[PDB]
Design a protein around this ligand. Structure first.
Ligand SMILES: [Ca+2]
Length: 781
């Protein structure tokens, strides 16, 4: 597993000097910029003053330097920066721009100037790597608690002392919950007062964990401990092995690829855990209550299967074998018709890992091409600027190929500039000719993502009478739902010559595509088109997608930039299922959580039975698929930790997305706990997903909400490689960045299913598609 934890060099911990300025301002400030040893926060002291400002790197979006940073325009700021550090180097080259945001749409900015270009570059490289470090982004609750510990030990610390009010501000805003913190501190034996500070020397992380035990009443652990220990007192080495090997492990998981824990191994771990927790009383091969609870919070119990999280999938199959992360009308930050168009958005969407972007290209009124949603009140941006942005961020987070979907409406003259600008901005990254071994001829499979790393492919145009009347009308409806994409400019040679493996063609019939046998010909279908084909011949659609690429996009009537649940189209094997990244609904939340895995590359390999040429498959099946083994899943939502700093009322919800017959929404919801943002104890009877026809396509999602139905957090767990047992589940926001301490504690059952044992073809299928709606019972009408 090639993933590593952050490694912050002494230079950054000790810190470097910068000047900080703000846009639309005459003045500035010199600061000492710093990172904590674990690499979780940027922090600096605003001079001769109280405290330290902080940026939580979990929400850092990008840090940039040199040519990609924003230099100051105000005269007297410019002056400062030139004479700051070394006067040799041009100001541009000392500049560092940081953008952050709890979500990637509403951003905040930080502008800085360093002493030379190396410092700039170093912070730029280092900080980024910390923010996008996957292990840090998937750390278990003990990790987040440590994160808090490091905040208090570096940022909040004043003269080697940790103020109590800082410990309070971090954990609560409510008065009673703050007094809970007070009393908890007192139990430990620390100073308890509003105005006290704890000496650093007394403030070790192990006692800071006893603080956790004192603060929260994790009553769950009593019964868990009694289950495993029974009347035998403490959990022996042998008991704990069986616990790890039976309950905490999937019965299907391959014994030799994933070897069982051993007596000797468990001994080592019990020792680690009892050292953190017991010290004075630790015994060789004996695990106490607090030892066990520690484990359940520690990295070894992390729900994330590192093997699936790492970039470990086979990258060496045809492109058509992959689910590819896709964006629709990338340029829009908001509403479809009144919304703003952005250059920045292209950066952000790429930085999430997204691989397929869209560029609606329109003729600009001064000779220079623009991007916008044509004939609407949306704003316009410059095409030249957009492609330079694309090139900048195309391969920061993923080495694997980007596909640019072009809606071309330009004049022949302006199209020559599109082409030229692509060459200018992309230089060597632009794939303007096929590669060896994959000529554009019939029978030849597409290249592999591995073959096409650090390349950018262009999807532009290159240079059915006889129907029934209801078909004609169904087609007219498709065409208008296509919006502006329905009619495009004809291709100019200078543009057509850049297209190769991704040639969009006007899809006709399925039999047509396999007779032509042209793996490089693809089809971009508006959702209305897709649903038609999907309902008519679903199996044929699955087979089509084994060799060729299907892109799917939102119908025009979704003016709010609403999204469909992508599992509808992934079920058919559609690779480029494009979404509106500016809208954080269920669909988008699901998308971002799914594409985290596989080193967050934007690529996920389809399940095997979907790539096998000879095998027929019906995504609308309700009985089991031959070869593929069905499963049962049981989720028992027990409690939550640190949902909020205020005393909220919350409930938890659990949904599943995948095949129609496996998709469940608005069915499972816990009792509501009132007035407790800290340790609400739901204790809900398990939620059973009895028959999961096809787990490899299925994901499960835990959602936590405030009483009024306001979003608090969520977590996504694909069934392919899910870990059962008691697990801590740290919640994430909608952009799939962590909330931090906010977590859920659940018991998971994952195993193989074992049993005891009209309507029109497409009416039945259309009915199945309601499972995906936000209101499955009512939408079924
Ligand atoms: Ca469009």
């Amino acid at each position: 597993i090639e993933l590593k934890w952050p490694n912050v060099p002494e230079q950054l911990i000790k810190g470097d000097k910068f000047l900080k300025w703000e846009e639309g301002s005459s003045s500035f400030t010199e600061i000492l910029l710093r990172v904590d040893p674990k690499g979780y926060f940027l922090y600096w002291k605003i001079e001769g003053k109280e405290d330290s400002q902080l940026l939580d790197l979990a929400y850092l979006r990008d840090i940039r330097c040199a040519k990609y940073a924003k230099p100051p325009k105000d005269k007297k700021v410019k002056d400062a920066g030139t004479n700051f550090g070394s006067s040799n180097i041009p100001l541009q080259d000392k500049c560092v721009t940081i953008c952050h945001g709890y979500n990637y749409i509403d951003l905040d900015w930080i502008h800085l100037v360093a002493e030379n270009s190396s410092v700039a570059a170093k912070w730029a490289e280092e900080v980024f790597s910390y923010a996008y470090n996957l292990l840090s982004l998937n750390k278990n609750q003990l990790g987040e608690w440590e994160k808090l510990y490091f905040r208090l030990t570096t940022v909040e610390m004043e003269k080697n002392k940790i103020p109590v009010k800082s410990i309070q501000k971090c954990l609560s805003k409510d008065k009673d919950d703050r007094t809970r913190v007070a009393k908890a501190i007192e139990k430990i034996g620390w100073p308890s007062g509003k105005n006290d500070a704890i000496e650093i020397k007394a403030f070790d992380f192990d006692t800071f964990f006893k603080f956790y035990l004192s603060l929260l009443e994790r009553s769950e652990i009593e019964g868990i401990f009694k289950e495993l220990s029974q009347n035998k007192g403490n959990i022996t080495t042998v008991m704990f092995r069986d616990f790890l090997n039976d309950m905490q492990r999937h019965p299907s998981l391959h014994k030799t690829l994933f070897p069982l824990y051993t007596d000797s191994q468990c001994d080592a771990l019990i020792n680690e855990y009892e050292s953190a927790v017991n010290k004075k009383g630790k015994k060789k091969g004996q695990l106490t209550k607090e030892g066990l609870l520690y484990f359940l919070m520690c990295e070894e119990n992390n729900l994330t299967p590192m093997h699936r999280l790492d970039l470990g999938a086979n990258m060496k199959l045809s492109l058509a074998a992959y689910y590819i992360n896709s964006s629709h009308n990338t340029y829009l930050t908001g509403h479809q018709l009144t919304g703003k168009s952005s250059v920045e958005i292209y950066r952000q969407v790429l930085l999430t890992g997204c691989r397929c972007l869209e560029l609606d290209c329109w003729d600009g009124k001064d000779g220079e091409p623009i991007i916008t949603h044509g004939f609407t009140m949306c704003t316009e941006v410059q095409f030249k600027d957009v492609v330079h942005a694309i090139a900048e961020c195309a391969f920061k987070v993923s080495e694997y190929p980007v596909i640019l979907s072009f809606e071309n409406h330009c004049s022949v003259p302006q199209q020559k500039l599109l082409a030229q600008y692509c060459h200018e901005a992309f230089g060597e990254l632009l794939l303007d000719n096929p590669i060896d071994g994959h000529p554009l001829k019939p029978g030849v499979p597409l290249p592999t993502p591995y073959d096409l790393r650090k390349k950018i492919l262009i999807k532009n145009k290159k240079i059915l009478a006889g129907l029934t009347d209801e078909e004609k009308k169904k087609i007219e409806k498709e065409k208008k739902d296509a919006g502006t994409a329905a009619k495009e400019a004809e291709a100019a040679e200078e543009m057509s010559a850049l297209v190769n493996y991704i040639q969009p063609v006007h899809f006709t019939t399925f039999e047509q595509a396999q007779k032509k046998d042209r793996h490089y010909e693809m089809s971009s279908m508006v959702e209305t088109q897709a649903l038609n084909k999907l309902k008519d011949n679903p199996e044929d659609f699955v087979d089509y997608n084994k060799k060729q690429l299907t892109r799917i996009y939102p119908k025009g009537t979704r003016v709010d930039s609403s999204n469909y649940v992508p599992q509808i189209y992934w079920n058919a094997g559609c690779q480029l299922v494009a979404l509106n990244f500016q809208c954080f609904d269920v669909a988008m939340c699901v998308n971002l959580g799914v594409f985290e895995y596989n080193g967050c590359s934007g690529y996920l390999l389809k399940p095997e039975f979907m790539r096998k040429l000879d095998k027929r498959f019906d995504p609308f099946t309700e009985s089991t698929v031959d070869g593929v083994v069905a499963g049962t899943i049981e989720i028992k939502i027990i409690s939550a930790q640190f949902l909020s700093d205020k005393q909220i009322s919350s409930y938890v919800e659990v949904e599943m997305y995948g095949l129609p017959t496996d998709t469940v929404r608005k069915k499972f919801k816990t009792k509501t706990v009132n007035n407790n943002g800290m340790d609400p104890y739901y204790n809900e009877n398990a939620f059973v997903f009895k028959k999961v026809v096809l787990p490899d396509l299925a994901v499960v999602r835990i959602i936590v909400n405030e009483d009024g139905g306001k979003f608090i957090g969520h977590r996504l767990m694909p069934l392919d490689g899910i870990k059962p047992g008691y697990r801590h589940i740290p919640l994430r926001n909608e952009s799939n960045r962590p909330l931090g301490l906010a977590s859920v504690f659940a018991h998971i059952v994952a195993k193989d299913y074992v049993s005891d044992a009209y309507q029109s073809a497409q009416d039945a299928r259309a009915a199945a598609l309601c499972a995906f709606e936000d209101d499955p019972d009512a939408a079924l009408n």
